[PDB]
Each structure stands twice: as structure tokens, then as C-alpha cells.
Write a protein that binds this ligand. Structure first.
Ligand SMILES: *[C@@H]1O[C@H](CO)[C@@H](O[C@@H]2O[C@H](CO)[C@@H](O)[C@H](O)[C@H]2NC(C)=O)[C@H](O)[C@H]1NC(C)=O
Ligand SMILES: *[C@@H]1O[C@H](CO)[C@@H](O)[C@H](O)[C@H]1NC(C)=O
Ligand SMILES: *[C@@H]1O[C@H](CO)[C@@H](O)[C@H](O)[C@H]1NC(C)=O
Ligand SMILES: *[C@@H]1O[C@H](CO)[C@@H](O)[C@H](O)[C@H]1NC(C)=O
Ligand SMILES: *[C@@H]1O[C@H](CO)[C@@H](O)[C@H](O)[C@H]1NC(C)=O
Ligand SMILES: *[C@@H]1O[C@H](CO)[C@@H](O)[C@H](O)[C@H]1NC(C)=O
Ligand SMILES: *[C@@H]1O[C@H](CO)[C@@H](O)[C@H](O)[C@H]1NC(C)=O
Ligand SMILES: *[C@@H]1O[C@H](CO)[C@@H](O)[C@H](O)[C@H]1NC(C)=O
Ligand SMILES: *[C@@H]1O[C@H](CO)[C@@H](O)[C@H](O)[C@H]1NC(C)=O
Ligand SMILES: *[C@@H]1O[C@H](CO)[C@@H](O)[C@H](O)[C@H]1NC(C)=O
Ligand SMILES: *[C@@H]1O[C@H](CO)[C@@H](O)[C@H](O)[C@H]1NC(C)=O
Ligand SMILES: *[C@@H]1O[C@H](CO)[C@@H](O)[C@H](O)[C@H]1NC(C)=O
Ligand SMILES: *[C@@H]1O[C@H](CO)[C@@H](O)[C@H](O)[C@H]1NC(C)=O
Lengths: 50, 79, 44, 113, 287, 99, 49, 113
């Protein structure tokens, strides 16, 4: 209950981060799929492109 | 990891106290060696000591640092 | 002995003969010169 | 994640130091080299004038960088800084001590030899 | 398809000595101004390494099926791009996944499959009459193929198909490794002006492509390209020309190496621990 | 300078060894405690965590003992230096072959 | 557990040897001062030689 | 398995020492008492003249019995022995050091006091 003059270490200071970033790449690759819609002509409803 | 450290908290108390004691003992070593006198004596402006050249151990005003040319050579020698 | 279990004993750098030679040299200096040989050249 | 000034060979992703600690990772966004430095350093400390003398204290951080005085030995709060120098009693570090002087409050100053 | 050769007078292989060669980056991290030691398969220094000839002037053509140990070192003082690529496998009878890493005139082709590998595949270059350019026509590397999964093309690589008999101007070193089935490639082109007795200079090797195949490997063999000019009759029996080339094959051994990383981040020295007592003293003190 | 260089090199190499101690598993299946927690459940991975705790405690205790012995040697050398200052510097010492 | 026990015994032996070496260093420093003072001259320190 | 000079009582098979190590066993073939002594003794040491002085080194064995000089501190190979004595710089043990003198090669000699 009695403290004399001097320096004293009580606890430690930790800076806890508040946000997290886990993004590994800048962008992912693609596959050719726009030709399904970007086409010269389409198919009918009795025989449609799958 | 912290939950299992309460079983060894006394060990960390002894280790932290030992490190604090080592630090304060290192702090007290400089007070017992260099703090022999409690009055800072100024070097006289007259450098005529009967022919004894003391510029190599006395501080020089040419540099901002207060170290002597011997001490400056000593500081750069060690890493 | 105590060396069979990897507990090798290192021989000293200075043998007992060299230590005896040093002690005899110090004895001769302290009977023939006193303290002059310990603070400079030996004086008879 | 600070901006470094050292370039990386175009086949490496990680980076270590003399003490073997990963402190430089190349960001795969547009090939930026970013250093890593921990944000938490040291602990806290308190300056107490003592018993039958005062009731307030001064909190000192060991090396955390920020009434409030930015000392060489970390961050000291609750103790004003005065330019004059007296003999010091409570050591802090790096030539700066703390004392309770003139009402009266806790002050910090460079020690006198 | 492939054809058989005819017996002829050849030259026995010679043995040469390496001089601070076969050093690559053991990882993909950045290290600066630190002496870090690692346990990985490298080429021991000052070791007797095999030598194979490829010059014509005679008729030297040797392609033995050397065993592929845990890592090999392939150095060539290539001048006119006479060498083409490498093939791998265990039995080469369309029973395992045999690799085929070739470098054609348009693009590099890497495809491990079960090719019907012949006794001695080779690349044939024919000299046209109306066209004053050397063009590859005899693509005899295997008989057929059945199935496989992996195939890699990468960026196009341009080479010269004209073979000469002059001194070499470039040096190419290759390191092939297989750890946990992972295929490793390390290479770096280095200019030089010499015919033999590789210089004592230092040059690290940076990885180019890292193949996740996960297969077995125990044997390997290189591929060579010969020319069919107007001097030779054009039959692959006794008359051909191969220019001038020399490739060295070394086997990697597991030794601890102390690397010298500069402030830029590249390896400068590779002092050993099991070669010389002085080197062991250097690498035990980490200095 | 030999005396002034050993006290720095020994401390630096002790700090480096302390850093190197965290790269060992002490007989566990991993070195970093986050990997075992991410790949194994805490009820099962308790013994590996405790083994890592014991290894780190042993390394820290050895470092503390080495630092205490070094501090004792430094205390003895500082007492010798203080006596040398107070005798040879702050006056003339009659002790032969001491200053 | 055999590794841990042998390591503990070796560490305790090393600590004991280090303490003994510190005591031997102190004794050797005392002997060196005695050789420099009482042998290599006459020491005015009373009740020292 | 050396030839010992101590006989056992005619009911024993083993033999220990003060340090409690089995170093004597009677041969069942002919009732012959044979001693046991380990072979691997000590480690190896390297004598280096230094950087920018020489390149060759000398290898010293600690407690192994064998250009080649059989010193009192083990086996020393790579350093010739010379009967004269100078002041020694690189210590070895048992009163004999090694140095690099006069071309010039590593030599070993008894040190001069
Ligand atoms: C005391 O010694 C110093 C040596 O450092 C002298 O300084 C040198 O003086 C000479 C003579 O003019 C110069 O050429 C040097 O460049 C000086 N060196 C330095 C480091 O200053 C100094 O003159 C001496 N003083 C006395 C009174 O003797
Ligand atoms: C189709 O073409 C248009 C214009 O050429 C383009 O903007 C679009 O991204 C393409 N793809 C799709 C899925 O619409
Ligand atoms: C980032 O993504 C874009 C595609 O949106 C790509 O063109 C670019 O090369 C990427 N940057 C890298 C890989 O550094
Ligand atoms: C402390 O932080 C402030 C602002 O973040 C900055 O201006 C100052 O330079 C920092 N101090 C040090 C010593 O880096
Ligand atoms: C202390 O006095 C000096 C005198 O020039 C002045 O520059 C400085 O600002 C003063 N400091 C305070 C805290 O008043
Ligand atoms: C040359 O190589 C052989 C086989 O690798 C080896 O036995 C021989 O010692 C080597 N030559 C020299 C001079 O080391
Ligand atoms: C080169 O060889 C590859 C097979 O390795 C083949 O795919 C390619 O078409 C060839 N190039 C030419 C121009 O024939
Ligand atoms: C290829 O066919 C063979 C049959 O000869 C079979 O054993 C092998 O598994 C096939 N490879 C793949 C990848 O399916
Ligand atoms: C790889 O080859 C080794 C012998 O060289 C054999 O023991 C092993 O079973 C093989 N593994 C596979 C997957 O074929
Ligand atoms: C490496 O980078 C440093 C700093 O930019 C530079 O001084 C040095 O010349 C570089 N080394 C090479 C080989 O380019
Ligand atoms: C060892 O065995 C052989 C054959 O049984 C016998 O003749 C001989 O006496 C034996 N020696 C002993 C028991 O010392
Ligand atoms: C070392 O061995 C040799 C031959 O084995 C022997 O003549 C010599 O006496 C041995 N040295 C010692 C010190 O026993
Ligand atoms: C050194 O000189 C002595 C003098 O008698 C001689 O006995 C000894 O053999 C010499 N040693 C050598 C190595 O020459």
C-alpha cells in the first residue's frame, strides 16, 4: 500500500490490429466464355447451344 | 498459449525481476566509475602547461561533439 | 579414469615445467634486483 | 507496411534479415516491395513521487512513439517538460529524469552532472 | 519413327574438374548482407566432372543413357545452338511418364508423356539449295504416343540453326532436381570466350519454370542436332556433321553450403563445409 | 580492442541464439504455435503446445543464467575500474604494477 | 524424455562449472594482484601480504 | 581388447572401474581377461595463419594417437616440427604452439618464455 519514488514496470502495451487484408492476387485469370454471347449468330429453342 | 502460462507465471516473475536487476546493476556501474566528482570542472582557456600538449585528450571546440580526438578515434574503432 | 564417456580433459597450455621456470625467474629477479625488474630494466 | 527502397530480384516473394525474420514481402498487386515492422514495442512504466508527497503519477512508455512530452526514451505523459536542469532523483533514461517540483506538479528535465 | 546407326570409331569420354560451379538459389526468399547456410543438394567444388564431346573433326557422337541421381548439373558452352533439349524417363518403353523438354525454333515444348522412345533420338537439320538457311526437317524424337496430361509452351525462344566450327561465345548451365516429385529448373546464360577449362568466376542460377508433375525419375539423356549439308551424302549411317559443342554432366550431392548474399541480394560465394578444413573453419564461424 | 568487443559480440550472439530457439520444434510437429492450432484442435494439440512452452522456458532460463553470469563479471570489472579510477586517476597510487 | 533428462543434467553441470570458473577467475585476479604487489615490490597495504 | 595383467576370481564375468564403466570382460573361449577402451577421443582443430597472410591450414587431433608430428597434445598434421624456439602466437597446448614462418610454411615449436 506504500509506494516510494522510482521507476516501476506494471504491464505491457500491445497495439492490436483492427483490420485484416488477406487478398493474395491482384486479379484472377479468365476462360473464354464471352463467345457464348458475343457470337455471329445464335441457336434456336428446339436445339440450343449447351 | 497465455492460459497455460498461468502454471508458470512465477517463473516469468523471477525472469523479469532478474532482467530488471541486471539492467539496474548496469545502470549503477556507470555511476560508480565516472561520477567520482560532483563538481564539473571547466578546462582553462590557457593551454600553456609548461610545454605539455594536452589537445589529444582534452575536448576540442572545432567539432559539435564533446569527445576528444582520442575518444573519437576510440568510438569509430569499435562497433 | 573419467574419459571413457566422451568427457575429454584438455591439457593446459603451460606445463608444470614452464610454471616452475617462471617461478624460478621471478625468484632470481627478486633476489638479484628487488623491485627494479618489476618496474623496468633489472638493476643489480 | 512502409515503402522500402531496396529492389527484389524478379523471382522472389519473401524476404528476411540478418536475424532471420520475415520483414519484407513483395506485394503481388503491382510488384511493390513493402517492409514489415511490428507495431507493439516494449511495455509501460509509471513515475511516482512517493508516499506523503503527492497522489498523481506519470505514465511512461518504453519505446512507443506518440501534458505529453516526446522524450528520447519513449513517450512520457502526465509530466510537463521544463528547459532548466536540476539534480535528478527518479531515473527514466537517456539523460532525462523526473521530479516533483513547483501549485506543484511532476516535471521532466535533463539531469545535471 | 527412328532409324539405327552404324558402328564407327568414336572417342572415349574424358574427365574434367569444376571450378566453383553449380550454385543456385535454394529458395525464393530475399536475403541481403547475411551469410545463411542451408542443407540442399548442390555440386561439390573441385570435383571430377564428366565431359562429353560433340565436334565432328573424328565423327564423335555419344549419347549414353546416364542415370538421373538426386539432382544433376548440366553445363554447356554453347555457341551456335547445336544442342536442343533433354528427355527423361525410367525405361523408355511407353510404360512410365517420360519427360521431353525440347526447344524448337519457334517455341519451347515441355510435355511429359509415354512416348515410344527409340534407341537414339536426334534432331535433323537439312540445308536447302534454293534457300541459304538451315531448317530442321527430320523430327525423329519418338515413334508414337498414347496419353498424358501435362503440356507447357511458355514464351517463344529464338535460336540460330547455323552450325560453325569456331570458338564458343556463350555458356549455358542447367540444374534439374526432383524433390517430392516437384521438377526444378535453374539456368542462367553467361557470356565467355574460352574452349575448355571453365573459369573460376562465380555465377548463381535463377529458376525459370517450376513444374508440379509429381512423377518418378531415375534416368536421363540429352538430345543433339546434326546438319545435312551438300558435303555429306545425307544419310544417317556414316556421313554427317555436328559442328562444335561440349556439354558437362555432374551429379549433385547433399552438402551444407554457406552462401554470400550482398546488399543487392545475389549470391557471390558458396564456401563449403565438407571440402577443405579451411572451408569448414569458415562455415563453422559463419564468417 | 578485445575487451570491449567481446561484451558486445557475446550479447549479440546470445540474442541471435534466443531468436534461433523459436525456429525449433523441441520434438513437436511444428515450430510456430499458430500452425498446430490451425491444423489441429486445441483439445488434442495441448501436449504439443505444452512441449513448446517447456522448450521456450528452458531456453529463456538458460539465457537468463548466462546473462546473470555475464552481469556478475561486468560488476567485478566495473568495481576494478572504479578502484583504478579512484586510485590512479584521482591521485597517485603507491601500489606497484597496478596502474 | 531421455534427451530432456540428459540435457537438464548437462545444463546443471555447465552452470556449476561456470560458477566455479567465476570463482576461479576471482581467485586468479587476487593472486595476480598479490604477485604484482607483494612479490614485484613492497606493498604498503597492512595485513594484505 | 588389450592384454590385461589383472586376474579375476573364478566366478566373475564382468569388470568395472571407479567410474562404474564395464572395461574388463573375461573371454569365455580361453578364460582370458581382456580390457575395454573406447577409440574415439576428443575432436579436431584447425590452425589458421589468418586472412591475407596464408591459405594453407594445419589440422590438430585432440586425444588421438597417430608433415606429421606426434605432439603431447594429440596428433598434428600439416605443420613441420623445428627444434628451435621463438615466441608463440597460436596456442595449442602442452607447451608447444604453432606459427607461420620461413618458402614459408606452418611450423610448430616449443614456446619461449
Ligand atoms: C599538440 O599536438 C597536436 C597533434 O594533434 C598538434 O596539432 C598538429 O599541429 C601540426 C603543426 O601545425 C599540424 O600540421 C597538424 O595538422 C596538427 N594536427 C591536428 C590534429 O591538429 C598541435 O599543434 C600540438 N600543440 C602544441 C602546443 O604542441
Ligand atoms: C462482348 O462484346 C462487348 C463489345 O465487343 C464487350 O463490351 C463485352 O465485354 C463482351 N462480353 C460480354 C459477356 O458481353
Ligand atoms: C493487375 O491486374 C491486371 C488485370 O486487371 C493485370 O493486367 C496486371 O498485370 C496486374 N498487375 C500485376 C500482375 O502486377
Ligand atoms: C512519431 O510519430 C510522428 C507521427 O506519427 C512522427 O512525426 C515522428 O517522426 C515519430 N517519431 C519518430 C522518432 O519516428
Ligand atoms: C527554454 O529556454 C530556451 C531559451 O532559448 C527556449 O529556446 C526554450 O523554448 C525554452 N523551453 C521552454 C519549454 O520554455
Ligand atoms: C577423377 O575422377 C575419378 C572418378 O570420379 C576419381 O576417382 C579421381 O580421383 C579423380 N581425379 C582426381 C585427380 O581427383
Ligand atoms: C517445333 O516442335 C514442336 C514440338 O516439340 C511443334 O509443336 C512445333 O510445331 C515445331 N515447330 C515448327 C515450326 O514445326
Ligand atoms: C494412360 O494409359 C495407360 C494404359 O496403357 C494407363 O495405365 C495410364 O493410367 C493412362 N494415363 C492416364 C493419365 O490416365
Ligand atoms: C519409383 O522408382 C523406385 C525405384 O527406382 C520404386 O521403388 C518406386 O516404387 C517408384 N515409384 C513409382 C510411383 O513408380
Ligand atoms: C545492387 O543495388 C545497389 C543499390 O541500388 C547498387 O549499388 C549495386 O550496384 C547493385 N548491384 C548490381 C550488380 O547491379
Ligand atoms: C567350444 O565348443 C567346441 C565344440 O562344441 C568345444 O570343443 C570346445 O571345448 C568349446 N570351448 C569352450 C566351451 O571354451
Ligand atoms: C601410438 O601408436 C603407435 C603404434 O600403434 C605406438 O607405437 C605408440 O606408442 C602410440 N603412442 C602412445 C602415446 O601410446
Ligand atoms: C634439433 O637439434 C638437436 C640438437 O642435438 C637435434 O638432436 C635434433 O634432432 C634437431 N631436430 C631437428 C628436427 O632437426
Amino acid at each position: 500500500f506504500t509506494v516510494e519514488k522510482g521507476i516501476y514496470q506494471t504491464s505491457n502495451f500491445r497495439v492490436q490490429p483492427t483490420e485484416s487484408i488477406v487478398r493474395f492476387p491482384n486479379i484472377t485469370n479468365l476462360c473464354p466464355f464471352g463467345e457464348v454471347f458475343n457470337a455471329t449468330r445464335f441457336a434456336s429453342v428446339y436445339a440450343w447451344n449447351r | 498459449c497465455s492460459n497455460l502460462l498461468l502454471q508458470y507465471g512465477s517463473f516469468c516473475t523471477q525472469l523479469n525481476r532478474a532482467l530488471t536487476g541486471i539492467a539496474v546493476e548496469q545502470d549503477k556501474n556507470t555511476q560508480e566509475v565516472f561520477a567520482q566528482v560532483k563538481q564539473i570542472y571547466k578546462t582553462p582557456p590557457i593551454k600553456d602547461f609548461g610545454g605539455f600538449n594536452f589537445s589529444q585528450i582534452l575536448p576540442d571546440p572545432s567539432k559539435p561533439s564533446k569527445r576528444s580526438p582520442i575518444e573519437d578515434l576510440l568510438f569509430n574503432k569499435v562497433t | 579414469a573419467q574419459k571413457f564417456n566422451g568427457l575429454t580433459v584438455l591439457p593446459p597450455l603451460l606445463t608444470d615445467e614452464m610454471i616452475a621456470q617462471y617461478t624460478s625467474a621471478l625468484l632470481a629477479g627478486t633476489i638479484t634486483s628487488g623491485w627494479t625488474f618489476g618496474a623496468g630494466p633489472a638493476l643489480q | 507496411l512502409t515503402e522500402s527502397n531496396k529492389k527484389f530480384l524478379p523471382f522472389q516473394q519473401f524476404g528476411r534479415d540478418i536475424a532471420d525474420t520475415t520483414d519484407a514481402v513483395r506485394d503481388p498487386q503491382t510488384l511493390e516491395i513493402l517492409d514489415i515492422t511490428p507495431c507493439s514495442f516494449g511495455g509501460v512504466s509509471v513515475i511516482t513521487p512517493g508516499t506523503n508527497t503527492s497522489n498523481q503519477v506519470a505514465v511512461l512508455y518504453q519505446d512507443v512513439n506518440c501534458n505529453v512530452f516526446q522524450t528520447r526514451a519513449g513517450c512520457l505523459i502526465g509530466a510537463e517538460h521544463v528547459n532548466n536542469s536540476y539534480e535528478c532523483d527518479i531515473p527514466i533514461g537517456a539523460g532525462i529524469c523526473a521530479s516533483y517540483q513547483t501549485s506543484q506538479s511532476i516535471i521532466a528535465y535533463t539531469m545535471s552532472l | 519413327q527412328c532409324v539405327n546407326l552404324t558402328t564407327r570409331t568414336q572417342l572415349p569420354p574424358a574427365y574434367t574438374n569444376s571450378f566453383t560451379r553449380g550454385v543456385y538459389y535454394p529458395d525464393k526468399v530475399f536475403r541481403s548482407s547475411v551469410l545463411h547456410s542451408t542443407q540442399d543438394l548442390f555440386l561439390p567444388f573441385f570435383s571430377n566432372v564428366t565431359w562429353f564431346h560433340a565436334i565432328h573433326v573424328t565423327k564423335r557422337f555419344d549419347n549414353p543413357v546416364l542415370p538421373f541421381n538426386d539432382g544433376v548439373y548440366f553445363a554447356s558452352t554453347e555457341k551456335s545452338n547445336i544442342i536442343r533439349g533433354w528427355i527423361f524417363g525410367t525405361t523408355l518403353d511407353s510404360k512410365t511418364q517420360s519427360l521431353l523438354i525440347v526447344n524448337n525454333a519457334t517455341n519451347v515444348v515441355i510435355k511429359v508423356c509415354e512416348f515410344q522412345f527409340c534407341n537414339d533420338p536426334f534432331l535433323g537439320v537439312y540445308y536447302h539449295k534454293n534457300n541459304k538457311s538451315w531448317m530442321e526437317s527430320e523430327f525423329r524424337v519418338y515413334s508414337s504416343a498414347n496419353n498424358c496430361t501435362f503440356e507447357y509452351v511458355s514464351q517463344p525462344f529464338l535460336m540460330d540453326l547455323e552450325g560453325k566450327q569456331g570458338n564458343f561465345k556463350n555458356l549455358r548451365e542447367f540444374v534439374f532436381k526432383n524433390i517430392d516429385g516437384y521438377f526444378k529448373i535453374y539456368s542462367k546464360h553467361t557470356p565467355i570466350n574460352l574452349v575448355r577449362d571453365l573459369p573460376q568466376g562465380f555465377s548463381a542460377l535463377e529458376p525459370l519454370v517450376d513444374l508440379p508433375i509429381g512423377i518418378n525419375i531415375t534416368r536421363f539423356q540429352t538430345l543433339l542436332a546434326l546438319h545435312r549439308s551438300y558435303l555429306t551424302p545425307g544419310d544417317s549411317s556414316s556421313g554427317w556433321t555436328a559442328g562444335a559443342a561440349a556439354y558437362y554432366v555432374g551429379y549433385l550431392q547433399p552438402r551444407t553450403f554457406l552462401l554470400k548474399y550482398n546488399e543487392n541480394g545475389t549470391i557471390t560465394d558458396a564456401v563449403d563445409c565438407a571440402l577443405d578444413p579451411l572451408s569448414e573453419t569458415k562455415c563453422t564461424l559463419k564468417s | 580492442l578485445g575487451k570491449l568487443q567481446d561484451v558486445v559480440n557475446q550479447n549479440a550472439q546470445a540474442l541471435n541464439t534466443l531468436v534461433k530457439q523459436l525456429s525449433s520444434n523441441f520434438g513437436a510437429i511444428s515450430s510456430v504455435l499458430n500452425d498446430i492450432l490451425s491444423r489441429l484442435d486445441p483439445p488434442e494439440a495441448e501436449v504439443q503446445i505444452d512441449r513448446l512452452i517447456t522448450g521456450r522456458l528452458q531456453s529463456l532460463q538458460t539465457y537468463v543464467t548466462q546473462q546473470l553470469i555475464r552481469a556478475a563479471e561486468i560488476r567485478a570489472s566495473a568495481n576494478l575500474a572504479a578502484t583504478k579510477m579512484s586510485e590512479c586517476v584521482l591521485g597517485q597510487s603507491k601500489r606497484v604494477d597496478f596502474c
